[PDB]
RNA sequence: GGACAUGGGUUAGUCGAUCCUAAGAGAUAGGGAAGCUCCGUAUGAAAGGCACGAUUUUUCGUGCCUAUCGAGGGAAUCCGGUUAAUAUUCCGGAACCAGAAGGUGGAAUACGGCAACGUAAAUGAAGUUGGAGACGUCGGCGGGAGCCCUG
RNA sequence: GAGUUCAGCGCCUCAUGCUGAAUCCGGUGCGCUCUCGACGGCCAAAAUCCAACGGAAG
């Protein structure tokens, strides 16, 4: 549930939330790994003048679930927890891309609900650099 | 035909002219008409082997079946799963007589019928066990095959050779002669692929330098060549020369597995990107045809060794069956068309069809689901 | 030769944006639209956008460079500037107080004639007849609109004059074929010189302007069509031997006489019929439609003078009236509803009077213009460009409505 | 041979944004054009007019209780040309009694001794004459407005006319014009229902949009059938 | 005979120039000078275009950015053969570059690895930034090629 | 299939072709030339091209 940022790889400068920690070590990742789901495409600044389809398109966000090491991650004071974000992270979802795709779809749906509710605004807004 | 009282629809219907008002939108609709005449971009244009519905439903697996295989005779099917219990089902009867438990990533029977040894890989350890159901002579002949990877020599748990690998084995293959065992572990980087010789009782890595992850591995069914399906492409290596042969790019983000016909010329490969690519070594490195039938990730594809049919299993719960005739004539291209689309399979945790096996004699498909249910589409 | 630079030929050269076309012609937007309205000019979407926009991405309207270069030599463009000159000289006169050079200047205000626009836009008379339907819809629409500050009174007079002359022509030529009704109005339909002409007549009514239509555009279209109507009708009358324009009597016209003011100095469907128009019906549409098929037409004097008949003359074959009550009902003038006439027009057949008689249920109106699994799953996956979607779009909306209206017949029979 | 017309290249998003900004800028200007000065001359001019108007009333009423009574027309047409600031109390009430509460209003009046007298009282402010059937036709059919339940309602439906005027045998717009031109029994009720028209002077040519206080040269008094021509220009 | 007489001979998308600037020359804005002319080139120069918009009073509104000559710099082709005198030019054979449109197919409604990084594709306006081009000199060492030496 | 070197033939002939083959296995450098690369020190500009940030448009 702790908000984390990725400073390495393609998803550089992307905020993520630790759905399941693998810091205890794993055969796949012999390091302080952590399978987390973050936001790659932050929702655009939706304007009330825009249409309902226009608002949803701007508010659409692309999530991303990946496993990264603790060194590659960066802890943050802020933290967000979701009921649907607990228990849905497992090796089976990572192993099965269809399970991963459904996991990505569910995570985006939860994030879209969070963005629609106005929660996690700092996480929802992309960070500058 | 929208006017006073048309039976076409009931816009609005009006009884007479007096009730009919003046149209308010007429000036607006004519105003847009004007815009048309100078703002609308005027772009011009020109104006049958029947694998019938499954009738045998094999149950007993407490969890998802990780992999299922059929013995050389084809009358016995061995499947393994994360539950840790291996169940062997008789094709003719469906009985679970060999229910000894003894997470099995994969299970495969030896290519030789005279040596009925089934190799089941659990995590990083693979055990070659000779079941007591087979003949005693067959069990004795299997032990003589064996009796990098460390090799070591329970309700009929006759273990012959146990091999431990540096990484958890994901794909297991056996040679046509049965003296070579191929182990593929995507986790490992330097030693992802390991080749074990049963005759010498040892294992080694055929690749001097390994870069990139490997998702599947197989051997050519016609020549001493090994095909390894990596994440993005598939590389064929001539084990005789220990050199490359051909590299085929599937054009997908992540390859799932690969299947090859008995001829060893036309192959069907599944990918995690819900893609089914049919490629021929004599046509081009690029696939001869592409398919995206699965609504979810294409788990695996299987081609019948004898029947001119192929099957593809995916996590969407739908299995596609296609009939393909391949001719040796240069001008006769392979004619492959779909034959059936299996459905009515339960989906759990976004996982549907996991392992599909073709009968050694007829065009019967054995599909094991995530719920432990095996459907035998005869 | 040198390495040829990007965007020096092809789609990056012919296609030129609106802003460039402004500065190439040296015009403001409003004048550019005016010369685009008067001439035949319209945006053309390039096949490769970012190629045609010097690598840009933003949405921009495009025109053919060949098209813009034609507008460079248009002689009327000068008459736009001569009016820009004229406006400043008339402002000068009013500023100094010359209330007379203001009056003479306005008399000599610059003009432009669309004679060469019409010739270069429609070369052949058949070309005009094809692309004139909107003109008929346009002019007929305006003749029933209150004169505003945006649209001058004389322009309305031009609509009414040109509208009636066309109505006289069709009745004289008997070229009217169909006349459909709808809440839009009276969808007329005739044919001339083989070509088919269709338009819509608004209900003559005390309408309101929605205060969002930009009347500036609509004003130029009238300044275009009202030029077209004069020369199109001129050929028709010369072909028919009539002297164009037909003479108009002011005294008759100020009595709401309709076509009666102008003198033209199954075509016989209603040849042997006499009709009278009561004082509750759309006389303007009914006068035109009946006389197009030889119907002898008289009307209530309150609708306008010039009625050849009176109320008491029993020669009328059908006294049309949609009023629910007829106190002084006549004989020999069988009383029917106006929908009967248009139904007869569409079918070209004398319809049944009593079903359309007064107080009778109105009949509906008709618009006169109006192994398998395997064979359907192989071409869905084993082919490239996917024109298979044509069924999913073309057939879907036709199948659904066909299924829907076929169920209307069954459900309506159940009601009976 | 198929020229597909696509969607406009107009960006309706920005168009209404410009329109809203245009309206936003317009209302501010009206709220800014406030409390202008008034010279000492206009105070004189009002007084000279007020005594000029007041003396006219005394001569009109006293010693001149005679009206020439325009004949051969039961129905007249009266419109208000202009009014004077700080209106005389008599004219202020009389104009309201004729429903001409605001300038450029058009009202029909049945010709009689009484009506012509009140018109003679307010003669310097009104241009009145005899409309022809056609002129009355276009007035109702292009500028006719109803008073349904007391709001500003356009005569857009014949059902509304029947609903509010059924019991006086008025069903349609054509019934209205026939009644008004004939001045039948229900003439008073129809005229009560009719909302006054608004014949604001039209400004099309460049000379009109610039000359000051342009009202098409509308005089005050009797104009005969010229009111028909004025209506023809106006409608 | 390089003499005269009489004829023939130089073939290029890929080789060079034409394309650029350096030091400077240098027209113009200006200012001197009786005058030919002189000074001046950043100079108290109104010194160049971009986008937006149902069309804005059917008379253009709104918003943004601030010469020229002059030789080392520079995209892309080799082989074999061919003449009295010609070759990266000609011939025969084989490629490469730039630019141009539409057409087909592929994907499209980008990806995996803790990582450096990689793939057949894999939106990017205004505005902002960088790299290459584009770089001093000497000495030794490693790698290769060719000549020469040698079986 | 080119070229190079041998052996043979075609014959009044501008017949100038035709037939066979080989055109191979190596090694060496305080040599000489050039090239690239890892070090040690001693102390141009312009033309032109590429990429990034950026998030207007759908």
Curated annotation (Swiss-Prot), chain A:
> What keywords appear on the UniProt entry?
Cytoplasm, Nucleus, Ribonucleoprotein, Ribosomal protein
Q: Which domain of life is it from?
A: Eukaryota
Instruction: Answer yes or no on keyword 4Fe-4S.
Output: no
State the Gene Ontology terms under molecular function. structural constituent of ribosome
A GO biological process of this protein is:
cytoplasmic translation
Q: Where in the cell is it found?
A: Cytoplasm; Nucleus
Q: Which PROSITE patterns match?
A: RIBOSOMAL_L27E
Coiled-coil residue spans: none
Q: What does this protein do?
A: Component of the ribosome, a large ribonucleoprotein complex responsible for the synthesis of proteins in the cell. The small ribosomal subunit (SSU) binds messenger RNAs (mRNAs) and translates the encoded message by selecting cognate aminoacyl-transfer RNA (tRNA) molecules. The large subunit (LSU) contains the ribosomal catalytic site termed the peptidyl transferase center (PTC), which catalyzes the formation of peptide bonds, thereby polymerizing the amino acids delivered by tRNAs into a polypeptide chain.
Q: How does it assemble?
A: Component of the large ribosomal subunit (LSU). Mature yeast ribosomes consist of a small (40S) and a large (60S) subunit. The 40S small subunit contains 1 molecule of ribosomal RNA (18S rRNA) and at least 33 different proteins. The large 60S subunit contains 3 rRNA molecules (25S, 5.8S and 5S rRNA) and at least 46 different proteins.
Tell me which family the UniProt entry assigns to this protein. Answer: Belongs to the eukaryotic ribosomal protein eL27 family.
Q: What else is known?
A: There are 2 genes for eL27 in S.pombe.
Name under which the protein is recorded:
Large ribosomal subunit protein eL27A
- Organism, scientific name: Schizosaccharomyces pombe (strain 972 / ATCC 24843)
Q: What is the lineage of its organism?
A: Eukaryota, Fungi, Dikarya, Ascomycota, Taphrinomycotina
From Swiss-Prot, chain B:
Ordered alphabetically, the record's keywords are: Nucleus, Phosphoprotein, Repeat, Ribosome biogenesis, rRNA processing, WD repeat
Q: Which domain of life is it from?
A: Eukaryota
In which broad location class does this protein mainly occur, judging by the first location in its UniProt entry?
nucleus
GO terms under biological process: assembly of large subunit precursor of preribosome; maturation of 5.8S rRNA from tricistronic rRNA transcript (SSU-rRNA, 5.8S rRNA, LSU-rRNA); maturation of LSU-rRNA from tricistronic rRNA transcript (SSU-rRNA, 5.8S rRNA, LSU-rRNA)
Places the protein is found: Nucleus, Nucleolus; Nucleus, Nucleoplasm
Q: Where are the WD repeats?
A: 60-99, 164-206, 209-247, 250-289, 293-332, 348-378
Listed GO cellular component terms? nucleolus; nucleoplasm; nucleus; PeBoW complex; preribosome; preribosome, large subunit precursor
Q: Which GO terms describe its molecular function?
A: ribonucleoprotein complex binding
Family recorded in the similarity comment: Belongs to the WD repeat BOP1/ERB1 family.
Question: What is the role of the protein in this entry?
Answer: Component of the NOP7 complex, which is required for maturation of the 25S and 5.8S ribosomal RNAs and formation of the 60S ribosome.
Quaternary state and interactors: Component of the NOP7 complex, composed of erb1, ppp1/nop7 and ytm1/SPAC890.04c. The complex is held together by erb1, which interacts with ppp1/nop7 via its N-terminal domain and with ytm1/SPAC890.04c via a high-affinity interaction between the seven-bladed beta-propeller domains of the 2 proteins. The NOP7 complex associates with the 66S pre-ribosome.
What this protein is called in its record is Ribosome biogenesis protein erb1
Coverage span on the entire protein: 297 to 740 of 740
From Swiss-Prot, chain C:
* Protein name per its UniProtKB record: Pescadillo homolog
Chain's role: Component of the NOP7 complex, which is required for maturation of the 25S and 5.8S ribosomal RNAs and formation of the 60S ribosome.
Q: Which family does it belong to?
A: Belongs to the pescadillo family.
Q: Write down the Gene3D superfamilies for this protein, in alphabetical order.
A: BRCT domain
Subcellular localization, per the record?
Nucleus, Nucleoplasm; Nucleus, Nucleolus
Q: Quote a single Gene Ontology cellular component term.
A: nucleus
Sequence ranges assigned to domain BRCT in this UniProt record: 266-358
- Quaternary state and interactors: Component of the NOP7 complex, composed of erb1/SPBC4F6.13c, ppp1/SPBC19F5.05c and ytm1/SPAC890.04c. Within the NOP7 complex erb1/SPBC4F6.13c appears to interact directly with ppp1/SPBC19F5.05c and ytm1/SPAC890.04c. The NOP7 complex also associates with the 66S pre-ribosome.
Q: Kindly indicate whether the keyword rRNA processing belongs to this entry.
A: yes
Annotated TM spans? none
- Would you say which domain of life the source belongs to? Eukaryota
> InterPro entries from the entry?
BRCT_dom, BRCT_dom_sf, PES
Q: Which Pfam families match?
A: Pescadillo_N
What one GO molecular function would you report for this record?
RNA binding
Q: Name one GO biological process term.
A: assembly of large subunit precursor of preribosome
Keyword set includes rRNA processing: yes
Q: Sorted alphabetically, which keywords does the UniProt record give?
A: Coiled coil, Nucleus, Ribosome biogenesis, rRNA processing
Please name the source species.
Schizosaccharomyces pombe (strain 972 / ATCC 24843)
Swiss-Prot record, chain D:
The record, for Gene3D superfamilies, names: Ribosomal protein L30, ferredoxin-like fold domain
What keywords are assigned to this protein?
Cytoplasm, Nucleus, Ribonucleoprotein, Ribosomal protein
Q: Name one GO biological process term.
A: assembly of large subunit precursor of preribosome
Gene Ontology CC terms: cytosolic large ribosomal subunit; nucleolus; preribosome; preribosome, large subunit precursor
Pfam families the UniProt entry points to: Ribosomal_L30, Ribosomal_L30_N
- Name one molecular function that GO assigns to this entry: structural constituent of ribosome
Q: What does the UniProt entry say about where the protein is found?
A: Cytoplasm; Nucleus, Nucleolus
The main location is: cytoplasm
Provide the assembly information. Answer: Component of the small ribosomal subunit (SSU). Mature yeast ribosomes consist of a small (40S) and a large (60S) subunit. The 40S small subunit contains 1 molecule of ribosomal RNA (18S rRNA) and at least 33 different proteins. The large 60S subunit contains 3 rRNA molecules (25S, 5.8S and 5S rRNA) and at least 46 different proteins.
Q: What does this protein do?
A: Component of the ribosome, a large ribonucleoprotein complex responsible for the synthesis of proteins in the cell. The small ribosomal subunit (SSU) binds messenger RNAs (mRNAs) and translates the encoded message by selecting cognate aminoacyl-transfer RNA (tRNA) molecules. The large subunit (LSU) contains the ribosomal catalytic site termed the peptidyl transferase center (PTC), which catalyzes the formation of peptide bonds, thereby polymerizing the amino acids delivered by tRNAs into a polypeptide chain.
The miscellaneous remark of the record is:
There are 3 genes for uL30 in S.pombe.
């Amino acid at each position: 549930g702790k908000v984390a940022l990725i400073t390495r790889g393609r998803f550089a400068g992307k905020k993520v939330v630790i759905l399941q920690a693998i810091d205890q070590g794993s055969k796949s990742h012999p390091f302080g790994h952590a399978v987390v789901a973050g936001v790659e495409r932050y929702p655009l600044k939706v304007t009330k003048s825009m249409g309902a389809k226009r608002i949803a398109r701007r508010s659409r966000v692309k999530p991303f679930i990946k496993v990264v090491n603790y060194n590659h991650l960066m802890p943050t004071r802020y933290a967000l927890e979701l009921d649907n974000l607990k228990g849905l992270i497992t090796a089976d979802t990572f192993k099965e891309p269809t399970q991963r795709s459904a996991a990505r779809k569910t995570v985006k749906k939860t994030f879209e609900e969070k963005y629609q509710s106005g929660k996690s605004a700092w996480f929802f807004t992309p960070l500058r650099f | 035909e929208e006017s006073y009282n048309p039976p076409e629809e009931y816009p609005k219907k009006y009884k007479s002219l007096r009730v009919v008002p003046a149209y308010s939108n007429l000036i607006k609709e004519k105003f847009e008409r004007c815009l048309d005449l100078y703002l609308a971009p005027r772009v011009r244009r020109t104006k049958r082997p029947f694998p019938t519905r499954c009738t045998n439903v094999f149950i007993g697996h407490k969890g998802r079946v990780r992999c299922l295989s059929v013995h050389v005779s084809g009358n016995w099917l061995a499947s393994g799963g994360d539950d840790g219990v291996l169940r062997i089902w008789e094709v003719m009867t469906g009985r679970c007589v060999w229910k000894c438990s003894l997470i099995i990533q994969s299970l495969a029977w030896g290519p030789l019928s005279d040596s009925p040894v089934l190799a089941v890989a659990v995590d990083e350890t693979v055990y070659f066990i000779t079941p007591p159901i087979f003949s005693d002579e067959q069990i004795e002949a299997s032990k003589e095959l064996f009796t990098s990877a460390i090799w070591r020599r329970l309700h009929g748990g006759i273990v012959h050779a146990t091999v431990s690998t540096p990484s958890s084995i994901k794909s297991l293959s056996w040679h046509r002669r049965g003296d070579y065992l191929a182990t593929s572990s995507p986790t490992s980087s330097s030693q992802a692929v390991l080749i074990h010789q049963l005759s010498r009782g040892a294992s080694q890595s055929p690749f001097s330098k390994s870069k990139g992850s490997v998702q599947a591995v197989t051997f050519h069914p016609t020549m001493p060549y090994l095909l390894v399906a990596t994440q993005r492409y598939v590389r064929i290596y001539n084990l005789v020369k220990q050199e490359l042969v051909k590299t085929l790019l599937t054009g997908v983000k992540w390859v799932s597995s690969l299947s090859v016909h008995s001829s060893g010329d036309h192959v069907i490969i599944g990918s995690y990107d819900k893609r089914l690519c049919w490629f021929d070594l004599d046509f081009s490195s690029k696939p001869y045809k592409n398919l995206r039938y699965h609504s979810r990730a294409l788990r695996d594809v299987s081609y019948h060794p004898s029947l001119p049919l192929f099957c593809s299993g995916s996590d969407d719960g739908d299995v596609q069956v296609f009939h393909g005739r391949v001719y040796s004539d240069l001008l006769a291209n392979p004619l492959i068309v779909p034959l059936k689309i299996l459905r009515n399979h339960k989906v759990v945790d976004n996982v549907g069809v996991l392992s599909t096996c073709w009968h050694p004699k007829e065009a019967w498909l054995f599909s094991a689901g995530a719920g432990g249910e095996i459907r035998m589409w005869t | 030769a040198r390495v040829k630079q990007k965007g020096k030929a092809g789609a990056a050269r012919i296609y030129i944006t609106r802003n460039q076309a402004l500065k190439k012609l040296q015009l403001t937007l409003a004048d550019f639209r005016r010369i685009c309205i008067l001439k035949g000019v319209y945006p053309r979407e390039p096949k490769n956008k970012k190629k045609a926009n010097k690598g840009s991405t933003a949405p921009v309207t495009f025109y053919y460079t060949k098209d813009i270069q034609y507008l460079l030599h248009e002689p009327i463009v000068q008459k736009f500037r001569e009016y820009k000159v004229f406006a400043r000289k008339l402002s000068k006169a009013l500023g100094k107080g010359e209330l007379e050079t203001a009056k003479r200047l306005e008399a000599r205000k610059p003009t432009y004639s669309l004679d060469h626009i019409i010739k270069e836009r429609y070369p052949t008379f058949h070309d005009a007849l094809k692309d004139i339907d909107d003109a008929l819809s346009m002019l007929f629409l305006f003749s029933t609109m209150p004169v505003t500050d945006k649209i001058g009174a004389a322009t309305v007079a031009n609509c009414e004059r040109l509208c009636a002359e066309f109505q006289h022509y069709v009745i004289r030529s008997n070229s009217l074929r169909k006349a459909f009704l709808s809440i839009k109005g009276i969808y007329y339909q005739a044919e001339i010189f083989g070509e088919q002409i269709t338009w819509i007549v608004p209900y003559k009514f005390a309408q309101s302007v929605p205060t969002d239509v930009d009347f500036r555009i609509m004003h130029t279209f009238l300044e275009f069509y009202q030029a077209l109507m004069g020369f199109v009708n001129f050929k028709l009358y010369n072909t028919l031997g009539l002297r164009y324009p037909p003479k108009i009597d002011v005294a008759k016209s100020e009595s709401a006489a309709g076509l009666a003011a102008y003198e033209l100095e199954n075509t016989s469907l209603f040849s042997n019929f006499t009709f009278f128009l009561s004082r509750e019906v759309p006389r303007f549409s009914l006068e035109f439609v009946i006389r197009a098929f030889g119907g002898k037409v008289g009307w209530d004097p309150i609708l306008g003078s010039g009625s050849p008949f009176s109320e008491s003359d029993p020669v009328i074959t059908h006294h049309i009236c949609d009023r629910p009550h007829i106190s002084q009902k006549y004989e020999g003038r069988i009383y029917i509803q106006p929908q009967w006439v248009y139904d007869s027009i569409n079918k070209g057949i004398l319809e049944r009077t009593d079903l359309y008689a007064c107080g009778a249920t109105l009949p509906p109106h008709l618009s006169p213009f109006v192994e398998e699994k395997e064979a359907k799953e192989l071409s869905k996956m084993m082919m490239s460009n996917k024109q298979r979607k044509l069924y999913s779009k073309l057939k879907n909306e036709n199948s659904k409505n066909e299924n829907y209206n076929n169920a209307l017949r069954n459900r309506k029979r159940d009601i009976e | 041979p198929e020229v597909l017309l696509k969607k406009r290249k107009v960006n309706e998003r920005t168009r209404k944004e410009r329109v809203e900004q245009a309206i936003a800028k317009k209302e501010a200007q009206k709220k800014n054009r406030k409390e202008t000065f008034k010279r000492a001359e206009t105070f004189i001019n009002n007084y000279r007019q007020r005594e000029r108007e007041r003396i006219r009333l005394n001569r009109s009423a006293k010693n001149k209780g005679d009206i020439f009574v325009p004949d051969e027309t039961k129905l007249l047409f009266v419109i208000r040309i202009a009014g004077v600031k700080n209106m005389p109390p008599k004219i202020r009430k009389v104009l309201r009694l004729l429903r001409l509460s605001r300038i450029n209003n058009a009202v029909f009046v049945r010709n009689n001794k009484a009506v012509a007298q009140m018109l003679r009282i307010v003669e310097p402010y009104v241009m009145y004459g005899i409309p022809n059937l056609h002129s009355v036709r276009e007035l109702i059919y292009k500028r006719g407005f109803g008073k349904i339940n007391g709001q500003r309602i356009a005569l857009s439906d014949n059902a509304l006319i029947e609903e509010a005027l059924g019991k006086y045998d008025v069903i349609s717009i054509e019934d209205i014009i026939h009644e008004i031109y004939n001045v039948g029994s229900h003439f008073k009720e129809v005229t009560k229902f009719l909302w006054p028209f608004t014949l604001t002077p039209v400004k099309h040519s460049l000379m009109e949009k610039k000359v000051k206080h342009f009202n098409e040269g509308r005089k005050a008094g009797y104009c005969g059938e010229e009111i028909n021509e004025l209506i023809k220009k106006q409608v």
